[PDB]
Amino acid sequence: DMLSPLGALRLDGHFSFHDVSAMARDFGNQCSFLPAAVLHPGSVSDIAATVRHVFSLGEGSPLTVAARGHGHSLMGQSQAAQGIVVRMESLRGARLQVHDGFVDAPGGELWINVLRETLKHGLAPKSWTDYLHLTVGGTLSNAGVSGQAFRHGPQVSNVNQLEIVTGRGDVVTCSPEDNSDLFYAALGGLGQFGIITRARIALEPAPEMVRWIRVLYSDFESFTEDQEMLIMAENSFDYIEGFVIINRTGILNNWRASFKPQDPVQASHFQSDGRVLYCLELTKNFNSGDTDTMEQEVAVLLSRLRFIQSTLFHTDVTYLEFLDRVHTSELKLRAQSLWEVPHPWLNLLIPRSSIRRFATEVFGRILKDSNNGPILLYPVNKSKWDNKTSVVIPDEEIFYLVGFLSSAPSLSGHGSIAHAMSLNSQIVEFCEEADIGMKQYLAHYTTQEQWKTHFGARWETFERRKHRYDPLAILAPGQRIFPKASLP
Ligand SMILES: *Cc1cc2c(cc1C)nc1c(=O)[nH]c(=O)nc-1n2C[C@H](O)[C@H](O)[C@H](O)COP(=O)(O)OP(=O)(O)OC[C@H]1O[C@@H](n2cnc3c(N)ncnc32)[C@H](O)[C@@H]1O
C-alpha cells in the first residue's frame, strides 16, 4: 500500500481517497484520469510534506503530484492518473495582503478575488486574462494574456516574487534577485518546477470606469494594420483585442443588447450575412472627473482608423464590469447547460509576417463557419515578454494570439468533437506545411519528442531546470513532457 503512508502523515489538512471524481475532470471535458488521492491542504507545510514523501520513495514508485487551480486545463494538464491532486483552492487563511503597491496572493486564489480585495485600496493588477475565475498559480504557470499584454506584457511579466514548493519538497522564496533561476523557470513552467503557493503581483491605480468600444472591418489587411499601429502608439487604448466573425448574421443587433450605436440609422441596415467580418475591441480607462478629457482623447485615436463608420458601438461600464465580462457569458451558458461541454480549443501564436497568409487559408478556405465558438485575433509586442522564462513565443517582434475558442455540444454533425478535431488538425497541418512559424499556447503534446520540437532551442534550459528542481518528474504529469523517474 503506497497510500497507507499518506494517511499516516499528520497533516493540517487531509487526504481524500474515494470521492475523487471531480479531480478527474477539467474544462476541456475530454480527458478523465482518476487520481489515487486528493490532498485537501490546510497549509503549505502539507504540500511540502506530500511532495517530500513522494520524493523519498525515489524512482521505484509511480506516484505523481498535480496541483489543481480552477481546472481550466483542456487536456488533463491539472490531472494525475493514479497520483495525488493538490486542490490549491482549498488552501485557506488570510494570506491575501496589499503593500507597497503590490499584492501577495496565494497560488490558489482566483484573479477575481485578488481584484475585489485590491480595489478596496484603489489599486489593481496591470495585466489580465479574459476570464478572472482562474488561479494566480495556474495562469502564471502559462503566461496569462488579455488586451493589456501589448503594453504591460503577460501576467508572467508583472510578477515580483514567488513562493515555490519544488519537486524535492523544498519551500523556496524566489525573485529576479534571489533563487532567480527557479523564479524565471516557473513562469510559463507548466507546473514542472514546483507548486506556486504564493505570488507578489504588481498593482497600478485602478480606473473607476471604462469606455468599451467595438467596430467592424471587412478587410483583414486594414484590421491588422490598424491593430499593429495601436499596439505601437503612445497614449493608445488601455485594452486592444479582435475577433473573426465567420458566416454569422445580424451581429450589430446582437450588440444593441449591451452597446449603444454611434448613428443607429446606418447600423440598422448593415448585413453580416456571407461575408467574413473582423471586430476591433478597444477600451479607454477613465475616471468620472476626466470624462471630457477622455472623449476628446478617444475621438483622436479613432480618427486614425479605417473601420466601417456605422458599426461603431460603444458603452461606458465600471472597470470591474468590463474585467468580469466573461462571467456573464459563463452564467448564460450554464443556464442552457452549455458550460460543461467538450471544448476542443486551438490556441496559436502566429508571427506578424505570416498573419495575412494564415488568415487567407484559415478563414477564407479551412473555415466555412465560426458559429461553433469565437475566434480571437490580436497582436502583441515580444519586447514585453522576458526570454528568461519557460514561455515559448515566435522570434518576430510582433506576433498574434489566435484562439479558436470552440465548443462541441453534439455527438454528431458539425460540433461534434471529431469535426472540431479535424478542423484543428488542418490548421496545425497547414501551419507546418506552409512554413508559418507558429508556436502553440496552452499546448497539449503527448510525447517528449513533440515537446522538444515545441521548445526547440529552449529545450536544453527546460531539461536543465527540470533535472534541477524536479529530478524524479513528480510534478504536473498531465503536461506529458517528462515520464515519472525519466531525466538522464
Ligand atoms: C477556461 C478558460 C481558460 C482560459 C480563458 C478563458 C476560459 C473560459 N481565457 C484565457 C485568457 O484570456 N488568457 C490566457 O492566458 N489563458 C486563458 N485561459 C486558459 C487558462 O489561463 C489556463 O487554463 C490556466 O491553466 C489557468 O487555469 P487554472 O487556475 O484553472 O489552473 P489549472 O487549469 O488547474 O492547471 C493549469 C496547469 O498549471 C498547473 N498548476 C495549477 N496550479 C498551480 C500552482 N499553484 N503552481 C504550479 N502549477 C500549478 C497544473 O497542474 C496544470 O498543469
Side-chain angles (χ1 to χ4, degrees):
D1 215 84
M2 232 178 247
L3 66 85
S4 278
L6 257 24
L9 307 177
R10 62 235 190 276
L11 298 178
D12 291 323
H14 80 108
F15 279 108
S16 249
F17 292 104
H18 305 107
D19 231 44
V20 305
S21 264
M23 315 305 284
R25 67 139 80 216
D26 63 28
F27 187 76
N29 286 295
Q30 284 160 271
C31 301
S32 168
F33 299 99
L34 276 142
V38 178
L39 167 66
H40 286 95
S43 81
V44 326
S45 155
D46 284 1
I47 300 132
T50 300
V51 178
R52 234 178 256 121
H53 176 255
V54 176
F55 190 76
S56 105
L57 315 165
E59 26 223 71
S61 169
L63 270 179
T64 52
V65 181
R68 182 211 188 84
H70 207 61
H72 262 262
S73 290
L74 298 154
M75 290 297 126
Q77 293 94 326
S78 56
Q79 294 183 64
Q82 285 309 116
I84 312 157
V85 176
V86 182
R87 247 202 118 276
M88 293 300 291
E89 293 196 50
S90 269
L91 234 184
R92 278 154 209 277
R95 209 197 170 91
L96 185 71
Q97 307 290 328
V98 177
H99 64 93
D100 305 267
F102 287 100
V103 67
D104 287 325
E109 202 67 60
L110 309 181
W111 286 103
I112 189 56
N113 289 320
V114 171
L115 182 65
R116 288 166 188 158
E117 180 50 56
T118 247
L119 285 183
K120 297 185 192 155
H121 300 73
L123 298 156
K126 312 192 212 109
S127 184
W128 297 102
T129 51
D130 297 322
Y131 186 61
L132 311 190
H133 300 55
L134 294 185
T135 65
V136 165
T139 68
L140 290 180
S141 293
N142 288 282
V145 214
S146 189
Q148 310 86 16
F150 75 86
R151 197 200 272 158
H152 305 289
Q155 287 182 321
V156 116
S157 290
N158 301 264
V159 52
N160 280 242
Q161 204 209 257
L162 296 180
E163 176 189 35
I164 307 201
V165 178
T166 67
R168 285 166 201 272
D170 287 313
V171 205
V172 188
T173 300
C174 60
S175 74
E177 314 168 25
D178 185 30
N179 298 116
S180 65
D181 179 56
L182 181 53
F183 180 80
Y184 288 114
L187 300 171
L190 315 168
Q192 297 308 289
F193 317 116
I195 294 166
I196 299 174
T197 60
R198 198 182 225 185
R200 176 172 294 170
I201 300 129
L203 304 172
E204 72 181 355
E208 68 180 84
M209 298 289 299
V210 158
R211 169 143 295 157
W212 185 3
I213 295 140
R214 273 185 200 185
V215 291
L216 289 181
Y217 284 77
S218 72
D219 203 80
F220 187 78
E221 185 203 302
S222 296
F223 171 71
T224 58
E225 278 174 328
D226 286 29
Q227 270 187 334
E228 279 172 62
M229 98 81 189
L230 287 162
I231 68 151
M232 302 289 248
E234 218 62 29
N235 306 302
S236 186
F237 291 101
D238 300 286
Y239 164 105
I240 299 152
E241 269 187 48
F243 314 91
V244 191
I245 310 143
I246 302 179
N247 291 92
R248 228 266 83 84
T249 70
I251 187 64
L252 306 167
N253 292 269
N254 309 332
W255 280 7
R256 250 176 282 263
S258 317
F259 300 83
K260 197 221 154 285
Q262 220 57 259
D263 220 32
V265 277
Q266 342 158 83
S268 79
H269 312 293
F270 194 93
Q271 244 195 51
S272 322
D273 316 45
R275 191 185 28 169
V276 168
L277 300 179
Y278 308 93
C279 178
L280 179 70
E281 199 183 43
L282 306 159
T283 76
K284 188 79 188 73
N285 295 340
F286 73 100
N287 279 307
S288 282
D290 297 304
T291 314
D292 291 316
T293 325
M294 166 256 131
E295 284 169 319
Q296 280 135 59
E297 274 179 276
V298 174
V300 172
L301 275 151
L302 292 177
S303 78
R304 341 183 121 101
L305 307 164
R306 316 177 223 161
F307 60 86
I308 301 143
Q309 227 63 218
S310 61
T311 77
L312 169 65
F313 270 78
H314 98 279
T315 191
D316 278 9
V317 296
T318 80
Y319 194 40
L320 172 58
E321 289 188 303
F322 173 74
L323 296 171
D324 208 33
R325 87 212 164 273
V326 184
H327 187 255
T328 309
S329 315
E330 172 204 341
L331 288 194
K332 266 122 163 192
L333 298 169
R334 275 186 179 281
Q336 310 171 292
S337 291
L338 288 182
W339 181 257
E340 290 300 339
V341 308
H343 292 107
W345 285 12
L346 182 58
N347 312 280
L348 304 179
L349 298 176
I350 313 293
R352 187 218 154 270
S353 76
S354 299
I355 212 46
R356 297 211 209 113
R357 190 150 102 248
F358 180 86
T360 286
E361 198 98 344
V362 184
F363 317 135
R365 185 205 165 264
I366 308 167
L367 301 164
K368 229 279 156 205
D369 114 278
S370 88
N371 243 107
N372 55 277
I375 311 177
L376 268 59
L377 192 131
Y378 60 96
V380 299
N381 304 298
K382 180 187 187 71
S383 81
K384 302 303 187 175
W385 303 62
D386 208 299
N387 66 228
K388 284 173 263 320
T389 72
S390 316
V391 182
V392 180
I393 63 163
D395 223 307
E396 278 181 42
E397 282 314 302
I398 296 160
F399 62 89
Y400 284 77
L401 172 60
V402 187
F404 302 93
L405 269 48
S406 48
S407 292
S410 187
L411 297 156
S412 65
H414 274 215
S416 190
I417 118 133
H419 188 59
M421 220 115 191
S422 208
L423 294 176
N424 288 352
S425 312
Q426 285 168 64
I427 295 156
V428 177
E429 269 190 272
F430 163 77
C431 281
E432 211 303 278
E433 286 152 37
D435 207 87
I436 279 92
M438 172 276 278
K439 289 296 202 193
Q440 273 202 239
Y441 184 44
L442 318 150
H444 53 95
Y445 303 118
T446 58
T447 71
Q448 188 169 292
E449 257 271 76
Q450 287 163 280
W451 281 115
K452 287 205 187 188
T453 302
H454 175 72
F455 293 99
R458 309 177 69 80
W459 182 260
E460 194 182 21
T461 308
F462 204 88
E463 194 164 42
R464 181 187 57 72
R465 277 148 167 197
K466 185 78 187 192
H467 160 266
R468 197 172 163 174
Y469 316 103
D470 182 31
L472 298 173
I474 286 164
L475 324 156
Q479 290 294 345
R480 285 163 140 287
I481 318 160
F482 294 98
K484 168 90 205 278
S486 99
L487 293 130

